[PDB]
Design a protein around this ligand. Structure first.
Ligand SMILES: CN[C@@H]1CCc2c(ccc(O)c2O)[C@H]1O
Lengths: 334, 281, 50, 307
C-alpha cells in the first residue's frame, strides 16, 4: 500500500542527495559581489481606490495594468502617468491580473470562482467581456497568457488548468496536488510552467503532457509566489516563512536558501531581473529586498510603502521594476 | 543683567515654537499616509503657528528688550495686524478641529460623506478669510486706533508704539477670536465626553470583566489656561482703564503666545505623526 | 494509487551534477550581465523615466 | 506628436472624473463579511435581513436528506429504501420512507448524520453578495463560503465587521469535537489573526428556541459534552425573557464560552457583540446597524487617544 510510496519517496530523496556534488555558494564564492544597490522611486502612480494584489508589465514595457477591490481594473501608462483605460469588474474581488503578449486582451481573476478576459483594444474604444471562463471551484489564484487564445489559471480547488477562450472549455486540467495552488509562472519558452501552492510544495507541469514532471518540496510553510530564471532552467519561490529558495530544474533539488535572521514576516511576490543576478523579493514587513541570486546576500534595502507590498514585476526590457502595495500606491522603482 | 536672561528665554521659546511648527508641517507634507482630511486642519494650524512664531514673537521680544520700536509706523501696523490674524487663525483652527471631532464621533456615518479634501480646503480657506476680515481689515483702515487723547501721541510718534484701541473693536475682536470658539469647543467636547462615557458604560456592561477624561482635560485646559486670562483682561481694560498695568498685559499676551509652541505636543501625539517624526530624525 | 504512479513516473529521471548547473547559471548571469539596467547604473539620457 | 499627449490628458481627465464618483460611492457603502459555518443557519439570517423551481430545489434537498438518513441507517419499506438507496412514484416511495420506526429513530438520532433542518421539518409533513440599506446608509454584505486553510480571510481587511453566525443548539452534535467547539476554534483563529488586526465581530446565536427545546429535555446533558458548565453559574447580570432558569444559564454559558477568548486575546479595536437571535426574529437588521454604528464610534474613540 503506502509502504511502496514511502520507499519510492525515500529513494527519490537519496537520489537527490547523491546528485549533490558542490554547493552553489562554494562555486560562486570566487565571483565578485554586486555591492550596494541604491534604488529610488523615479515615478509614483496614484489615484487608485483600494488595496491591490496584481500587476503584469506589458511586453511593450509601456503599458502597466493593476487591479483592486474597487471593482475596476485600470491600465496605467508608465512613462506619462496616464490611465489609458478603466475597466469595471463584474466581481468586486480580483486576486490576479494578466496582460497578453500581443496586448489585445487583459485577463482578471477573482474570488468569484470565474476568470474574466477583457478586450482592451476594440473599435470605438469600448471594453467588454470577450468570454468569461468556466468555474474553477474557488478563487482564481493567478492567471497568465501563453498566447492570445490560451490562458493558464490556478485556483483554490487544488487544480491548475489551461483553457481555450474560443471554446471556453478545459482543454487540459492539471490535477494531483494536495493543497490550494496560489501562484504560477510560465517559462520564456512557454513549453513549461510551474505552480506555487499552499501545500508547501512547488512542482513543474508540462503543457502538452499534462503531468507534473518534477516536484519540489523544500519549503516548510505555504509558498506565495514563483518566478523563472531568465535562462529558463531554474526558478525561485517565496514562502510564508522568511525563507526564499532557488531551485534548479536539472538538479531537481534546492540549490540556495535565501533567509536572514532579522526578517520574520512573509513573502508575497518574487521577480527576477532581466539578467537574473538580482532576485527582487517583496515582504510583508512593509518593504522589499533586492537580494543577490548567486552570493545569497542582501544587496540593498528597498522600502517605499506604508502597507505590505502585494505584487512585483520586472519589465521585459529590464529598464525598471514596479511594485504594488495595499496602500493603493503603485510605485515604479528604478 | 535681568534683561539678558529674559532675552535668552524669549529666543529659546521662539526657536522651540519654530522648530515644532516646522517639524509638524514637514511631517504632514512629506508622507502621503499622514495626509488625511482631518490633518489638513493640522496643516493649517501648523502654518499659522509657524508664521506667528517666526514673525511677531521675535519682533515682540525686540520691542520689549529695546523699549523702542526702531522700524516705521507702517511696519508696526503690519506687525500688529499679522499678529492678531495669526492668533485668530490659530484659535479658529482649534475650534474647527473640535467641530471635525464632533462630526466624527456623534454621527459616524455622516462624517465620511461630509468631510472631504475639497471640503477641508474650502473650510480652511473660509476660516482664514474670515480671520482676515475680522483682524487685518480694520487695522489697515485705522478704525481700531484710540479715540482718546492718551497714546495718540505714540501712534503719531514713530519711535514707540503700544496697543491702545477703541473699546468697540476690542470687544468684537476678542469675541470672534476666543469667546465664540470657546463656547463652541466647550459644547463639542462636553458632547464628546458624554459619548465616551456612554461607550465605556456599554463596554463595561457587555464584557462584565477615565482615560478619555484626561485627554479631554489636557486638550481643554492647555488652551484655556494659555489664552483665557489674556482675553479676559482684554475685555476688562477697555471698561476700567485704571484696572490693569502694562506689564500684566504683556505677560498675559506672551503666555497666550506660548500656546502655539505647546500645541504641536498636544495635537500631534498620533502614532502616524510619531512614525513620521522618527523617520525624519 | 495515483500518487504511487506519479512518483514512479518521476522517480527515473536523469540528473546533472550540481556543479555543472551552477557553472551554467553563473555563466549565463555573467554573459548577460552587461545588458541589465538594474545591475549597472542606467545612463541618465538613455533612462526613459528621467 | 502633441496631439497624442493632449488625447492622453483628456482620457486621464475623464477617468479621474468617473473615479471621483466611484470613490464617493465606495466610501459611502460599508462592507460586512459573513463567516457563517456550515449548517449554522446563516441562510435564515440573510433571508430575515433581506425581508416552482425553488420547490423543486426543496424537493431535491428533501431527497438528499432521505439519502443521508439511509446512509445513517447503513452506519448503524425495504424495497422503497433500496429504491432510494439505489436512487442515489418516487414521491410515493419517499412517503413510504420515514414511515418506518427505524427511520423515525434515525431522524431522532441526528447525532450520527448531519441533515438539513429546514428540509427535515417539511420532509415529515458560489459567492453571494447582498445589498440592503438601513436609515439611508449603504450596507452591502458578502458571503465567502469551505476551505480549511481559509486564505481568503486575509483578503478581508477593509470590511467594517465580520458577522460570525453560529447555532448554539449544535452542542449535541458529534463529528469524529462537536460543531460548537469547532466554531469556537474557528472564531479563535479569526480573532488571533495577524491580518485581522482592526476587525470586530458581530456574532448571532441562532436556534435559541431550539436550544431551549434541547435544554428542557434531558436527552443530552450539557456537562456531558462541556464539563466546565457544571461548575458554571449564571452571572449576576442577566437579560431574562418572559424562559426557564436552566435555559438562560445554558445560553449565558455558551455566550461566555464565545466571549472568553475574544476578551482575553485583544484589547482595543477588537470587540465582540453577542446577540441572542431567535428563529423568527425580524429585528436583526436593526441590530446589525446599531452594532456597526457602535463599532465605527468605538474605532473613532480608540483613535484620538480618547479610548
Ligand atoms: C499687543 N498684541 C496684540 C493686541 C491685540 C490682540 C492680540 C491677540 C488677539 C486679538 O484678538 C487681539 O485683539 C495681541 O496679540
Amino acid at each position: 500500500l503506502r509502504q511502496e510510496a514511502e520507499q519510492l519517496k525515500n529513494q527519490i530523496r537519496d537520489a537527490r542527495k547523491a546528485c549533490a556534488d558542490a554547493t552553489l555558494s562554494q562555486i560562486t564564492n570566487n565571483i565578485d559581489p554586486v555591492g550596494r544597490i541604491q534604488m529610488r522611486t523615479r515615478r509614483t502612480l496614484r489615484g487608485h481606490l483600494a488595496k491591490i494584489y496584481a500587476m503584469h508589465w506589458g511586453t511593450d514595457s509601456r503599458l502597466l495594468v493593476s487591479a483592486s477591490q474597487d471593482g475596476k481594473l485600470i491600465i496605467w501608462d508608465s512613462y506619462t502617468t496616464n490611465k489609458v483605460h478603466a475597466i469595471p469588474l463584474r466581481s468586486s474581488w480580483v486576486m490576479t491580473c494578466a496582460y497578453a503578449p500581443s496586448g489585445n486582451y487583459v485577463a482578471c481573476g477573482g474570488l468569484d470562482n470565474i476568470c474574466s478576459i477583457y478586450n482592451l483594444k476594440t473599435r470605438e474604444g469600448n471594453v467588454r467581456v470577450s468570454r468569461e471562463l468556466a468555474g474553477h471551484t474557488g478563487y482564481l489564484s493567478c492567471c497568465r497568457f501563453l498566447d492570445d487564445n490560451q490562458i493558464v489559471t490556478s485556483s483554490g480547488d487544488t487544480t491548475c488548468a489551461l483553457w481555450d477562450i474560443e471554446t471556453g472549455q478545459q482543454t487540459t486540467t492539471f490535477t494531483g496536488h494536495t493543497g490550494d495552488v496560489m501562484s504560477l509562472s510560465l517559462a520564456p519558452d512557454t513549453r513549461l510552467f510551474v505552480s506555487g501552492a499552499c501545500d508547501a510544495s512547488a512542482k513543474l507541469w508540462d503543457v502538452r503532457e499534462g503531468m507534473c514532471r518534477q516536484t519540489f518540496t523544500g519549503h516548510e510553510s505555504d509558498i506565495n509566489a514563483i518566478c523563472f530564471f531568465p535562462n529558463g532552467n531554474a526558478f525561485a519561490t517565496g514562502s510564508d516563512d522568511a525563507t526564499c529558495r532557488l531551485f534548479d530544474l536539472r538538479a531537481d533539488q534546492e540549490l540556495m536558501t535565501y533567509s536572514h535572521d532579522n526578517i520574520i514576516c512573509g513573502i508575497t511576490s518574487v521577480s527576477f531581473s532581466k539578467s537574473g543576478r538580482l532576485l527582487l523579493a517583496g515582504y510583508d514587513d512593509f518593504n522589499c529586498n533586492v537580494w543577490d541570486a548567486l552570493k545569497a546576500d542582501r544587496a540593498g534595502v528597498l522600502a517605499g510603502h506604508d502597507n505590505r507590498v502585494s505584487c512585483l514585476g520586472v519589465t521585459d526590457d529590464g529598464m525598471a521594476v514596479a511594485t504594488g502595495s495595499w496602500d493603493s500606491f503603485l510605485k515604479i522603482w528604478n | 543683567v535681568w534683561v539678558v536672561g529674559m532675552g535668552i528665554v524669549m529666543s529659546l521659546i521662539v526657536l522651540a515654537i519654530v522648530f515644532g511648527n516646522v517639524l509638524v508641517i514637514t511631517a504632514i507634507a512629506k508622507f502621503e499616509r499622514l495626509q488625511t482630511v482631518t490633518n489638513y486642519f493640522i496643516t493649517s494650524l501648523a502654518c499659522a503657528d509657524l508664521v506667528m512664531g517666526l514673525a511677531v514673537v521675535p519682533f515682540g521680544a525686540a520691542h520689549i528688550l529695546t523699549k523702542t520700536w526702531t522700524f516705521g509706523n507702517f511696519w508696526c501696523e503690519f506687525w500688529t495686524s499679522i499678529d492678531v490674524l495669526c492668533v485668530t487663525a490659530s484659535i479658529e483652527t482649534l475650534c474647527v478641529i473640535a467641530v471635525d471631532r464632533y462630526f466624527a464621533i456623534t454621527s459616524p456615518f455622516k462624517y465620511q460623506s461630509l468631510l472631504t479634501k475639497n471640503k477641508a480646503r474650502v473650510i480652511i480657506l473660509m476660516v482664514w478669510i474670515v480671520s482676515g476680515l475680522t483682524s487685518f481689515l480694520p487695522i489697515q483702515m485705522h478704525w481700531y486706533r484710540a479715540t482718546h487723547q492718551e497714546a495718540i501721541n505714540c501712534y503719531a510718534e514713530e519711535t514707540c508704539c503700544d496697543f491702545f484701541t477703541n473699546q468697540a473693536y476690542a470687544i468684537a475682536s476678542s469675541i470672534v477670536s476666543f469667546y465664540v470658539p470657546l463656547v463652541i469647543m466647550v459644547f463639542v467636547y462636553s458632547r464628546v465626553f458624554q459619548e465616551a462615557k456612554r461607550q465605556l458604560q456599554k463596554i463595561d456592561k457587555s464584557e462584565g470583566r477615565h482615560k478619555a477624561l484626561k485627554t479631554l482635560g489636557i486638550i481643554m485646559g492647555t488652551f484655556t489656561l494659555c489664552w483665557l486670562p489674556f482675553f479676559i483682561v482684554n475685555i476688562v481694560h477697555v471698561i476700567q482703564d485704571n484696572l490693569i498695568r502694562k506689564e500684566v498685559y504683556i505677560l498675559l499676551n506672551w503666555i497666550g503666545y506660548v500656546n502655539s509652541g505647546f500645541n504641536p505636543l498636544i495635537y500631534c501625539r498620533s502614532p502616524d505623526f510619531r512614525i513620521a517624526f522618527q523617520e525624519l530624525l | 494509487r495515483k500518487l504511487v504512479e506519479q512518483l514512479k513516473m518521476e522517480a527515473n529521471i536523469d540528473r546533472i551534477k550540481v556543479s555543472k548547473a551552477a557553472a551554467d547559471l553563473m555563466a549565463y548571469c555573467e554573459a548577460h550581465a552587461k545588458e541589465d539596467p538594474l545591475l549597472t547604473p542606467v545612463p541618465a539620457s538613455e533612462n526613459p523615466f528621467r | 506628436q502633441r496631439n497624442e499627449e493632449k488625447a492622453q490628458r483628456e482620457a486621464n481627465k475623464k477617468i479621474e472624473k468617473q473615479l471621483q464618483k466611484d470613490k464617493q460611492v465606495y466610501r459611502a457603502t460599508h462592507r460586512l463579511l459573513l463567516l457563517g459555518a456550515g449548517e449554522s443557519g446563516k441562510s435564515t439570517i440573510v433571508k430575515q435581513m433581506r425581508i416552482a423551481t425553488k420547490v423543486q430545489d426543496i424537493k431535491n434537498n428533501l431527497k438528499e436528506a432521505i439519502e443521508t438518513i439511509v446512509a445513517a441507517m447503513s452506519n448503524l419499506n425495504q424495497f422503497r429504501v433500496d429504491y432510494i438507496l439505489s436512487v442515489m412514484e418516487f414521491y410515493e416511495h419517499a412517503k413510504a420512507l420515514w414511515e418506518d420506526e427505524g427511520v423515525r429513530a434515525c431522524y431522532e438520532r441526528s447525532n450520527e448524520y448531519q441533515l438539513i433542518d429546514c428540509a427535515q421539518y417539511f420532509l415529515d409533513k458560489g459567492i453571494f453578495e447582498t445589498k440592503f440599506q438601513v436609515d439611508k446608509v449603504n450596507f452591502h454584505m458578502f458571503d465567502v463560503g469551505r476551505d480549511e486553510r481559509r486564505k481568503w480571510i486575509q483578503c478581508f481587511n477593509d470590511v467594517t465587521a465580520i458577522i460570525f453566525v453560529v447555532a448554539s443548539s449544535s452542542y449535541n452534535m458529534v463529528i469524529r469535537t462537536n460543531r460548537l467547539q469547532e466554531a469556537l476554534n474557528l472564531f479563535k483563529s479569526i480573532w488571533n489573526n495577524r491580518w485581522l488586526r482592526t476587525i470586530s465581530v458581530i456574532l448571532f446565536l441562532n436556534k435559541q428556541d431550539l436550544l431551549a427545546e434541547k435544554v428542557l429535555a434531558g436527552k443530552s446533558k450539557i456537562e456531558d459534552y462541556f464539563p466546565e458548565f457544571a461548575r458554571y453559574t449564571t452571572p449576576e447580570d442577566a437579560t431574562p425573557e418572559p424562559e426557564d432558569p436552566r435555559v438562560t444559564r445554558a445560553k449565558y454559558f455558551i455566550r461566555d464560552e464565545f466571549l472568553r477568548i475574544s476578551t482575553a486575546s485583544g484589547d482595543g479595536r477588537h470587540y465582540c457583540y453577542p446577540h441572542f437571535t431567535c428563529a423568527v426574529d425580524t429585528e436583526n437588521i436593526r441590530r446589525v446597524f446599531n452594532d456597526c454604528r457602535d463599532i465605527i464610534q468605538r474605532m473613532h474613540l480608540r483613535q484620538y487617544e480618547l479610548l
